[PDB]
Design a protein around this nucleic acid. Structure first.
Ligand SMILES: [Mg+2]
Lengths: 57, 114, 98, 93, 97, 223, 123, 223
RNA sequence: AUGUGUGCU
């Protein structure tokens, strides 16, 4: 995996959106779509506000 | 709101605007004090621009929670630079500065319900 | 201190005496009764869970130990106390959204 | 937020109508060459590495920013089924 | 604090400001010396702290100290999934492997 | 590597500057010092103290002139002037008008090499028999100083006016995250500047950079 | 041959080698297509021990049909990274969010930075 | 009114630097930005990879050694190998001994322009007939470089070590006042720097100054 | 592929 590949990978998504699901999904807002941002680390990073939405701590 | 310091009146005393003010500078009554109607901080620090009051806070002369006098959209207002800062935040967020000041409430703090 | 000994974590001394050979594989013990009994120090034994169980020596060659005194540390022991983590300098305060 | 969605949700009767419109637009925009776009001279979606969104990174972006202008028209029955498909592959590569 | 007081340093301007605010907060007593104010704060477990990324002092004393923290048996690498297309099963076409 | 500087500037007051890619941590390390300098260092001008003819106290009211003294004092703080030569350290502006007119920042009489960068600022509306003779002081301070700190008694019973020297109205910076193929934790500096019209955001910034350099050259001669 | 650079013994991979997701751990075939044992998409690491229970087994069980088993002990040391679970004795569970470098971290008047930052809203 | 600069470097490890006076709050406007670069940047020198006599993987033991391989290696990170010239990029130190003796780091075989400022460091205690023969490769990089990244295979069974490149160990600034009997609100910067020896605090501060300067130059040509 | 059990949510 070199620079080329990564840059191209940003070129494949752009406006592309992914679906994120919670553990016990219960109500409609149980799954939310977001636009992926290639961040480091290993864990999934999620916005604070939609926590209460599908009850995530 | 702190200790009364010394005396608690300017509901109407015409002398209290020019006299009592000096008192705080002496040592009498501190800044954001319920010295009735207003407080020294509302007399001493009258900021022209709404923005300028915020520039002042960066120079540690008035905290973001001290009650002073500002001028948003042309009229005298009794409030903290923090509150007016919130107002401006709500403004610049959605760009429409008119409804910005109208939708919020600048008379109480902000909580869950607010 | 009682936890580590009763849980069979580390290895203690069985009888009074001096230190013979502090190896990373063994500790030999000078029992006053003309006996040096052999102790294995076992470095990497896969726990049932997935962690690792290590024993590391704690006395140096040529020292007098006592009956019931440690000779090494268990997978969760620092000088004979229960060590299940770290002592970090923590500041309790809000920080960005992190 | 997305490119002026309140204009969009209001531009139609049902919110799902918009989804289907945007979708099928993107489809025929990708399938019959990315040239049957209706706002390609200056007012056109662009990207960040080079400015190469002028070609073909996203199909939906283009549809959404397309409907923003009165260039196209949706509806139930507008064009005969087969004819549309045929002439849409004729007029473009 | 004695280390500093001896070394040739003293009450930082920042510490002064923080103390000044702590007064209106009501942790320190009004009237003592900056050193004594800091003593009172240090009694309640609280102490001046600098932002680090700015150097502007956190206007308000906070409690610091060393507490005990373990790392739990869970990790992340134990639980990590990210496959797009891969193995299926002969018995069932639902993907796993 | 090497970071590009990108300008999106609107007129003479607001400007948005973005400098990227940056090394991890250098974003705030660079963005924070400049903001402290911009809000405190830049040489500007302001109304230090004012003397009106029938005004004794700061909290007074003069009949014939609609607006209370204080509100006028605020507008005095709202103007912005510029000196042509460095010689002009302290200059007094001078004004006089009566009747159903209105005073704007242009009515002040031009004293030598003094330029009023902002004219149509409304000073005060006057009624019939509305007499208004007042004078203004202008120094070249640096930042903001509360009136109750200086109070330049130019005349006898002149009024202390909070001096708003700082040309910039306000300055705010943010460090977002940009990636470089490999790593994503590359800091991204976006700094926005608000001035009064005396000087473009760009000018303020250049001034800041210089001010920081001159300070980095002090750690050269040990003793 | 590049994939066999680790394969030391006749069938067994060497001890002390580095295996990665997709690396060949054991080599063997059946009816001749490769049905060997490779390192799963998770992670390998460094091999520390290799046990083999042949047919000539000095008293073992061994499952029906099987002739010999090959078990590998692949160890690896993992550091505290963003996502690991942290807690105390008083009971505050919580994942790690961000590992701010030494510089932009809350530090005392003394040159001493702070190690961990706990939100008071949890108390 | 020109900033005086003063130095109090007690030895090679500790350093203290004083600037006085500065106008308004400019003490912190300089203190922190230096502190950032002092702890983030600056070239350091550390142990990159180590090869032991018989040891293959990191998780072994050695006959005659109290500390297992990992614990021994752990001691090598707290070792300061100071070079002399920029040419030295990859100095591969070597060491071997036996018999009951605490192998102090002062036992390494000395090299041309290379001096270890950390002589008392405990590597491993040796037992009766305990022998060690190892190659400790030393590189020159910047910042925290995790062993899991570079994977410098010196030999074939050489085990990579966390690269800790940061000669400065601690930084703390204080802001006092006085000087110039005119304006009382003044700044007095005092920057304290603690380093491991490989770079004396003075050199470090200078390098940091250079970094900040260079970065300040980047705001030059817009788009 | 089902059951038992534990762990986390
Ligand atoms: Mg939970």
């Amino acid at each position: 995996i070199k620079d080329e590949v990564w840059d191209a990978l940003e070129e494949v998504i752009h406006g592309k959106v992914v679906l994120l699901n919670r553990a016990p999904t219960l109500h409609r807002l149980g799954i939310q779509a977001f636009q992926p941002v290639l961040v480091e680390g290993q864990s999934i990073q999620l916005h604070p506000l939609v926590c209460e939405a599908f009850n995530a701590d | 709101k702190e200790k009364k310091g010394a005396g608690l009146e300017f509901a109407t005393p015409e002398e209290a605007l020019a006299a009592h003010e000096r008192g705080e500078v002496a040592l009498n009554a501190p800044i954001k004090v319920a010295g009735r109607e207003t407080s020294v901080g509302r007399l001493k620090y009258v900021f022209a621009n709404p923005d300028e009051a915020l520039l002042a806070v960066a120079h540690g002369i008035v905290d973001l929670q001290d009650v002073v006098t500002v001028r948003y959209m042309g009229k005298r207002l009794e409030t903290s630079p923090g509150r007016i800062l919130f107002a401006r935040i709500v403004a610049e967020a959605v760009e429409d500065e008119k409804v910005a000041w109208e939708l919020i409430q600048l008379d109480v703090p902000q909580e869950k319900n607010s | 201190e009682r936890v580590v000994r009763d849980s069979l974590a580390a290895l203690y001394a069985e009888e009074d005496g001096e230190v013979a050979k502090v190896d990373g594989n063994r500790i030999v013990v000078r029992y006053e009764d003309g006996r040096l009994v052999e102790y294995p120090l076992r470095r990497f034994y896969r726990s049932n869970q997935g962690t690792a169980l290590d024993q590391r020596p704690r006395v140096v060659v040529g020292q007098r130990v006592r009956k019931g005194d440690l000779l090494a540390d268990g997978p969760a022991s620092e000088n004979g106390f229960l060590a299940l983590g770290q002592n970090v300098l923590v500041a309790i305060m809000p920080f960005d959204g992190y | 937020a997305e490119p002026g969605i309140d204009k969009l949700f209001g531009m139609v009767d049902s919110k799902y109508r918009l989804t289907v419109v945007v979708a099928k637009r993107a489809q025929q925009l990708l399938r019959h060459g990315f040239k049957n776009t209706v706002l390609e001279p200056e007012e056109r979606p662009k990207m960040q590495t080079l400015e190469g969104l002028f070609d073909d990174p996203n199909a939906v972006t283009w549809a959404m920013k397309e409907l923003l202008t009165g260039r196209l028209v949706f509806g139930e029955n507008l064009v005969p089924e087969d004819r549309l498909q045929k002439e849409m592959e004729r007029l473009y590569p | 604090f004695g280390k500093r007081k001896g070394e040739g340093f003293g009450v930082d301007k920042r510490e002064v400001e923080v103390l000044r605010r702590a007064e209106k907060l009501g942790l320190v007593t009004p009237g003592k010396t900056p050193e004594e104010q800091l003593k009172e704060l240090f009694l309640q477990g609280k102490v001046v702290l600098y932002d680090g990324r700015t150097g502007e002092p956190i206007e308000g004393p906070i409690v610091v100290g060393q507490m005990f923290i373990m790392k739990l048996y869970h990790m992340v690498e134990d639980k990590m999934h990210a496959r797009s297309t891969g193995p299926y099963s002969l018995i069932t076409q639902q993907p796993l492997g | 590597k090497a970071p590009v500087f990108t300008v999106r500037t609107q007129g003479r007051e607001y400007g948005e500057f973005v400098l990227e890619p940056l090394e991890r941590g250098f974003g705030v390390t660079l963005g924070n010092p400049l903001r402290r300098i911009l809000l405190s260092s830049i040489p500007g001008t302001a109304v230090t103290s004012v003397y009106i003819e029938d005004v004794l106290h700061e909290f007074s009211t003069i009949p014939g002139v609609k607006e209370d003294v204080v509100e006028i004092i605020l507008n005095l703080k709202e103007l912005v002037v510029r000196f042509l030569n460095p010689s002009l350290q302290t200059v007094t502006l001078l004004l006089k008008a009566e009747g159903p007119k209105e005073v704007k920042a242009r009515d002040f009489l031009p004293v030598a090499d003094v330029e009023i960068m902002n004219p149509d600022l409304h000073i005060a509306t006057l009624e019939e028999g509305g007499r208004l003779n007042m004078e203004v002081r202008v120094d070249r301070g640096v930042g903001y100083v509360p009136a109750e700190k200086h109070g330049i008694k130019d005349r006898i019973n002149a009024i202390p006016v909070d001096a708003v020297f700082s040309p910039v109205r306000r300055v705010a910076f943010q460090v977002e995250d940009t990636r470089l193929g490999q790593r994503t934790d590359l800091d991204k500096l976006t700094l926005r500047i608000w001035t009064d019209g005396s000087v473009t955001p760009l000018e303020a910034l250049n001034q800041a950079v210089e001010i920081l350099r001159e300070h980095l050259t002090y750690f050269s001669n040990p003793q | 041959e590049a994939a066999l650079r680790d394969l030391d013994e006749e069938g067994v991979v060497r001890i002390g080698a580095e295996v990665k997701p997709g690396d060949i751990l054991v080599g063997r075939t059946s009816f001749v297509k490769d049905t060997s044992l490779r390192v799963p998409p998770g992670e390998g690491g460094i091999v520390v021990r290799t046990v083999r229970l042949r047919r000539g087994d000095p008293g073992v069980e061994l499952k029906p049909g099987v002739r010999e088993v090959v078990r590998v002990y692949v160890a690896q040391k993992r550091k505290l990274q963003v996502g690991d679970k942290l807690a105390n004795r008083h009971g505050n569970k919580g994942v790690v969010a961000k590992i701010l470098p030494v510089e932009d971290m809350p530090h005392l008047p003394d040159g001493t930075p702070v190690d961990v930052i706990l939100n008071p809203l949890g108390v």
